[PDB]
């Protein structure tokens, strides 16, 4: 009986709502009320990486905090040495419709994907002196939005077919499939321990997934519109998501609800990327009003603004050591801030 | 700088040279976004079209130019999240089958959505009204009121075609956008000429707007 199932679902939703409300004894604003604000944070463009002849859609750091990878619609995946701005490798893509890129923690491989529905894994540390396509992971009936390496032989992808996948690169076959989203999944954030991750979708919801088991543990729904970016808090007990509602939100996995909203009346545009600082006190959000906002994660204040780009800020990253911030945009330029 | 640092700099410069050469080569192509309803004639728009699921990219070289058409029908997803990838296209080629009274009001809504999309406010549109012979033979029995109840007038080829074109052009509400209409049949072998002429005019108009004339 479908009516009974609908009523039971409504009852369970009400139970969860009441449980979450009972745990809201205090707000993050009250607890952190008596904390010294960060004041004004002025960061300057210490590097500007040039060479892409089109919009830059993705950008990832290496684990050495010196090498990064960038993906552009001109068919190029470029590896930059941030300190010297030198180009280490230029990878011509078989398809120029790239929407994501990832850097293996070891630095031996990079990942690429987009509207071709294939995650191409490229091997950098090879003899013969040239980067070659190690793998072409297929089996997504929709474009790839984000991809991340768990290790040199495991990769997690999110697709526009509402599904996430966990692949073994060597075999080339999906070892797990995560389903439950009703709209296309736009972002994907691996946990510090790489035991579970979070995926946000256009259904205005985020889901916490246990990588090993292959199931959704919790579902967070606060946004009015699509979630385009998700990032984990450094300790893995919270994460931040930015939506087209011109708002970012911080969710706590233990309280199973929302802790703080980051929005301003003078911001009415979408959020394309979010990232935390090493200590978790700064939340960097990239906007399509062509600038980035640096927020006090514990006070909802806007500590600073990064205004250097002439077009949409589409990708944003912070090094593992917390030293520099990389911003990419459709203006075809990357910038490093400190 | 050490010896290896200088060698790395030289490598970077060579990489930049190759990137510049590739960009120069690529800038000479014309990019077209091919849209329409299913079985609306997209696959046979240009008989010399060469194919080079996801995004189906076809290419053909006509009148000194290289044309790239990107068919997006395998992307059964939310357009609002990847449509902006085609913001920099020269034109949109919208294919419509006149003989299909069932697909209309899905093609019309799609045309309205694409015309009023924020990324394509100033992007010209080349409209193909295909299967004019089939429509002409079909209209003898059903006087176009099965699809357009508000229509009144002769149910012949000319007036009905004019009404369909008017319905499609009435959704343009932007001065900088032009709609080019060409009515084809299955046996027309001159669609490349139509696309070439439309693209030439669009480029000339955009250059005039740039120069301020």
């Amino acid at each position, epitope marked *: 009986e479908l009516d009974q199932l609908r009523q039971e679902a409504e009852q369970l939703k009400n139970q969860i709502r009441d449980a979450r409300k009972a745990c809201a004894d205090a707000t993050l604003s009250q607890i952190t009320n008596n904390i010294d604000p960060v004041g004004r944070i002025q960061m300057r463009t210490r590097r500007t990486l040039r060479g892409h002849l089109a919009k830059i859609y993705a950008m990832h750091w290496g684990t050495d905090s010196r090498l990064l990878v960038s993906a552009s619609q001109d068919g190029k995946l470029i590896i930059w040495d941030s300190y010297t701005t030198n180009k280490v490798h230029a990878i011509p893509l078989r398809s120029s419709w790239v929407m994501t890129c990832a850097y293996a923690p070891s630095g031996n491989y990079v990942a690429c994907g987009g509207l071709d529905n294939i995650c191409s894994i490229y091997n950098l*540390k090879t003899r013969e002196g040239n980067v070659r396509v190690s793998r072409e992971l297929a089996g997504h009936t929709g474009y790839l939005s984000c991809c991340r390496f768990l290790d040199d032989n495991q990769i997690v992808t999110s697709s526009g077919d509402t599904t996430c996948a966990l692949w073994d690169i060597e075999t080339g076959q999906q070892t797990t499939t995560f389903t439950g989203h009703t709209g296309d999944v736009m972002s994907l954030s691996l946990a510090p321990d790489t035991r579970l991750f979070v995926s946000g979708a256009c259904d205005a919801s985020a889901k916490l997934w246990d990588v090993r088991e292959g199931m959704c543990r919790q579902t967070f729904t606060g946004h009015e519109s699509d979630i385009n970016a998700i990032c984990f808090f450094p300790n893995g007990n919270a994460f931040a998501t930015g939506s087209d509602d011109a708002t970012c939100r911080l969710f706590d996995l233990r309280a199973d609800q929302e802790l703080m909203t980051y929005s301003h009346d003078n911001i009415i545009c979408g959020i394309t990327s979010v990232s935390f600082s090493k200590s978790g006190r700064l939340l960097l959000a990239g906007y399509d009003d062509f600038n980035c906002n640096v927020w006090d994660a514990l006070k909802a204040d806007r500590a600073g603004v990064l205004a250097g780009h002439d077009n949409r800020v589409s990708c944003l990253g912070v090094t593992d050591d917390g030293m520099a911030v990389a911003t990419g945009s459709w203006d075809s330029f990357l910038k490093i801030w400190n | 700088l050490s010896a290896e640092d200088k060698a790395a700099v*030289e490598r970077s410069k060579m990489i930049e040279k190759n990137l510049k050469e590739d960009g120069i080569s690529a800038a000479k192509d014309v990019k077209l976004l091919l849209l329409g309803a299913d079985n609306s004639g997209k696959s046979t728009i240009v008989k010399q079209m060469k194919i080079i699921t996801g995004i189906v990219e076809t290419h053909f070289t006509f009148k000194n130019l290289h044309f790239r058409l990107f068919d997006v029908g395998g992307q059964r997803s939310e357009r609002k999240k990847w449509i902006h990838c085609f913001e920099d296209v020269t034109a949109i080629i919208f294919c419509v089958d006149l003989s299909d009274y069932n697909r209309m009001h899905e093609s019309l809504m799609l045309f309205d959505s694409i015309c009023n999309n924020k990324f394509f406010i100033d992007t010209s549109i080349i409209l193909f009204l295909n299967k004019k012979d089939l429509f002409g033979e079909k209209i003898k029995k059903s006087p176009l009121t099965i699809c357009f109840p508000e229509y009144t007038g002769p149910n012949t080829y000319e007036d009905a075609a004019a009404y369909i074109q008017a319905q499609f052009e009435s959704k343009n509400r932007s001065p900088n956008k032009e709609i080019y209409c060409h009515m084809t049949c299955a046996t027309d072998t001159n669609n490349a000429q139509v696309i070439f002429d439309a693209v030439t005019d669009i480029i000339i108009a955009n250059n005039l707007r740039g120069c301020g004339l």
Partner: single-chain antibody, 230 residues
Framework: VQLVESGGGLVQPGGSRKLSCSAS????????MHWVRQAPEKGLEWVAY????????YYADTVKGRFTISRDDPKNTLFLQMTSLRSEDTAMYYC??????????????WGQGTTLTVSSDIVMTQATSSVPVPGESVSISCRSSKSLLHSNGNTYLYWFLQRPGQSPQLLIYRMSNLASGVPDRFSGSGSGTAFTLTISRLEAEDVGVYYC?????????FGAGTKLEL
């Protein structure tokens, strides 16, 4: 990966000869190339270098004006044209590939050289010319006239091994980095002007002549060689 040197043979003093190295199995155009010669009973001496794109060419002072290095990328060949040959040019000539980018491993592959018989610089010092030694730990020391620690943090010292009847192979690059294809028994350590190669649990096939080289600045200079013997 394969480099096959050819040419050479017996020539009379004052003549000329062309050596040609054919490359296979790797992207030749993306590599710079070196010519390094070893005299019949002496160590390794760097002769010439031509970079990728043929942009930068360097010569050793003992050959400058007489040797010309060139490369034909589409045929994947490297040429060394020698004129005004002397008796000191008698040696085995090896062609070596080298690629330079952040984290690269230059001097990774050497070819089987060709025999040619004819009828300031940083000084690398090897403490000992021979060290008798299976299962034992060995330490080989190397000194330089100038500190090899560059301001960027890289120490440009390289350790090569030449086994009996074989071309040198790369063991360690930049004083600490173990080359791909080398067991972890080898280790490199030290400080400016004083460097050590530690071979833990020495085995057979670890026996040969060990060379330390500086890549801080040209010309590239080698040590006389330390020989481990059983």
């Amino acid at each position: 990966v394969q480099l096959v040197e050819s040419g050479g043979g017996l020539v009379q003093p004052g003549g000329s000869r062309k050596l040609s190295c054919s490359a296979s199995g790797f992207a030749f155009s993306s590599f710079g190339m070196h010519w390094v010669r070893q005299a019949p009973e002496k160590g390794l001496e760097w002769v010439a270098y031509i970079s990728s794109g043929s942009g930068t060419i360097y010569y050793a002072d003992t050959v400058k004006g007489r040797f010309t290095i060139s490369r034909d990328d589409p045929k994947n060949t490297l040429f060394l044209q020698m004129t005004s040959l002397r008796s000191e040019d008698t040696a085995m000539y090896y062609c070596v590939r080298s690629i330079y980018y952040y984290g690269s491993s230059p001097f990774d592959f050497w070819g089987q050289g060709t025999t040619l018989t004819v009828s300031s610089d940083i000084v690398m010092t090897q403490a000992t010319s021979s060290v008798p030694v299976p299962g034992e730990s060995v330490s080989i020391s190397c000194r330089s006239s100038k500190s090899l620690l560059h301001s960027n943090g890289n120490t440009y010292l390289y350790w090569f091994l030449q086994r009996p009847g074989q071309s040198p192979q790369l063991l360690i690059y930049r004083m600490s980095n173990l080359a791909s294809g080398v067991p972890d028994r080898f280790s490199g350590s030290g400080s400016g002007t004083a460097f050590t190669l530690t071979i833990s649990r020495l085995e057979a096939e670890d026996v040969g002549v060990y060379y330390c080289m500086q890549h801080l600045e040209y010309p590239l200079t080698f040590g006389a060689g330390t020989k481990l013997e059983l």
